[PDB]
Amino acid sequence: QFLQWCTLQPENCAVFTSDNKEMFQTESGLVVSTYSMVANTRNRSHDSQKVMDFLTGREWGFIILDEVHVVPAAMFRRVVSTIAAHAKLGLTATLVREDDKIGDLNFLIGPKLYEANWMELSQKGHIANVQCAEVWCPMTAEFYQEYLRETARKRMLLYIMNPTKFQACQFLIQYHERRGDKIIVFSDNVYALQEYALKMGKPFIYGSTPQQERMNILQNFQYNDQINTIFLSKVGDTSIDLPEATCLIQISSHYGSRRQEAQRLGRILRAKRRNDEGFNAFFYSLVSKDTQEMYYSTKRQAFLVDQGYAFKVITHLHGMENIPNLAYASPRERRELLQEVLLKNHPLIRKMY
């Protein structure tokens, strides 16, 4: 983005990463690095120690802290001390944390200089107009009994893995695929992500997936018309490159993470079809009824309603009985799915060795 938008030379630009560690030889320029590399208190390599010596010994004029919400962390905090910068600009979309340490940014970086009005940007067309909805999935009797008679870690997986959310997600996938939408289905639970993806015949990307397979699946999502839905784990929340998406379905979440909720909303807020009149992107949060997921979903949406978004509650999807292939409709298959969810949890001497 620097080399594209501004008249900065590649000889004036430098990158401090694992593969790239050479620095600019001019008297001034650009260096882009990561918080973990800068604040790595571990025993770093000699050349990276030399680069850190260069960064510390130079008096920097400007620092851009991208995703400044992670700055108040335990030792991401010290990157504003180890780098003596005259000006510090923290750029973010999600200025929330689930602890009270978000207010330490007034002492780390500075005061809250600017907040964008997301509704004003949406009505000016700078970001997409999203229809935020919360889809209530009533649990079955057997899954609710098992949800009551388990501890919290099994309870999480058991309200995620209910068949009603399978049916609602499958119906929404079919409906928006008929409408011609690029759909991202976010779920932090890896087992739930894989089970939904194998049940629905759509590709899934999570942490242990190889990078070449991830790039191939993302290219298929961007260009292939038969691949209109991708299932993403928490790899999709962090700043990775994603294709243009207009529909999003949130199956599971990481407790009441408002930052993750707004980061998921941001993946569809930048849709290309904003210039089309009457276009609307769609956000769905599929939540099991009468569980702690409702509590966590309200906690997550508390930040998005501060931005102006209204989450319409959907207790009924018209067409849930007319869908031909409904996942886990039969009681015997529901019992089988319950059983799977419950059963989830001197050089010569060297030849000896």
């Binding site: 009533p138 409408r179 509650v313 959907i314 207790t315 009924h316 999807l317 018209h318 849930m320």
Partner: protein
């Protein structure tokens, strides 16, 4: 074809007809007619033995009127040989003509200048020359005759200066004969020529024989470091149908952009989601007739 190609063809034809024999004329005219030509092709057209074309090809290569390519192919009978292709390199050939005729003029000037210094003398007994500068070291005591240093014989007069007018006449007769050459050089230096090679020369080939063992397809190697227009004519009646089809596509766009029911209207009150013209035209025709009476092997495939 191209006018500069015509001029260089006539220049090569003129120089091979002037400074070269008839067999050279035949070979170079075959090269100018068929753009590339292998040895069997020259044999088939000209009925010329390999030993007879030997001096011909050797002279034409040593003057660079033609050049050779050493490409071997793979015929279906697998009796491949490293055959040779003969073609013409137009810019190198014309540059060779300019250099040859230019330096020929240069040492013709040198020869007439050497004639233009006075003749000197030569000794008939020893067959050695002695110019006027060193003959005066060899004059006698009687101061009348130049005597040879070895033979002791009176030096006789040479003829370097009596033939100066003859050399000037020969120069003139060379020039008026080579006037077409210089005119062609002026035209091809005023205009711009394409530097052709074997690969370029394959483009305008007229083939020489049917059962040719020489295959003109080029074989590239690695490691050597030495659209369509379609129309839609309509009778202006189906254009209304096409406008209707574009309107149709507009309402499928409307259902692409349509707001869903569960977003447009509240879902609280609903249940929880879970498991005859022919004959009257004949009468018109009859009435019109009555009125008128009243006035009266498989390989790669590509979709191209």
């Amino acid at each position: 074809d191209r006018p500069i190609d015509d001029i260089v063809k006539n220049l090569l034809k003129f120089v091979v007809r002037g400074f070269y024999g008839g067999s050279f004329v035949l070979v170079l005219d075959a090269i100018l007619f068929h753009s590339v030509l292998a040895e069997d092709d020259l044999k088939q057209l000209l009925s010329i033995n390999k030993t007879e074309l030997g001096p011909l090809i050797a002279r034409l290569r040593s003057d660079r009127l033609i050049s050779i390519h050493k490409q071997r192919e793979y015929p279906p009978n697998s009796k491949s040989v490293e055959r040779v292709y003969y073609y013409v390199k137009y810019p190198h050939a014309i540059d060779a003509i300019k250099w040859k005729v230019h330096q020929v003029v240069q040492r013709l000037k040198d020869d007439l200048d050497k004639n233009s210094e006075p003749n000197g003398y030569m000794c008939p007994i020893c067959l050695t020359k002695y110019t006027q500068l060193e003959a005066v070291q060899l004059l006698n005591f009687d101061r009348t005759e130049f005597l040879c240093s070895l033979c002791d014989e009176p030096l006789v007069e040479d003829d370097s200066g009596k033939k100066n007018k003859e050399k000037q006449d020969k120069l003139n007769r060379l020039m008026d004969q080579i006037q077409p050459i210089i005119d062609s050089l002026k035209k091809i230096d005023d205009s711009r020529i394409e530097e052709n090679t074997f690969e370029i020369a394959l483009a305008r080939l007229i083939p020489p024989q049917n059962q040719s063992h020489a295959a003109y397809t080029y074989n590239p190697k690695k490691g050597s470091t030495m659209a369509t227009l379609h129309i839609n004519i309509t009778t202006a009646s189906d254009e209304v149908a096409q406008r209707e089809l574009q309107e149709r596509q507009a309402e499928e766009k409307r259902k692409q952009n349509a707001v869903p029911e569960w977003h447009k209207q509240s879902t609280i009150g609903k249940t929880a989601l879970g498991r005859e013209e022919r004959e009257n035209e004949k009468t018109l025709n009859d009435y019109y007739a009555a009125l008128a009476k009243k006035q009266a092997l498989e390989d790669e495939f590509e979709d191209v």
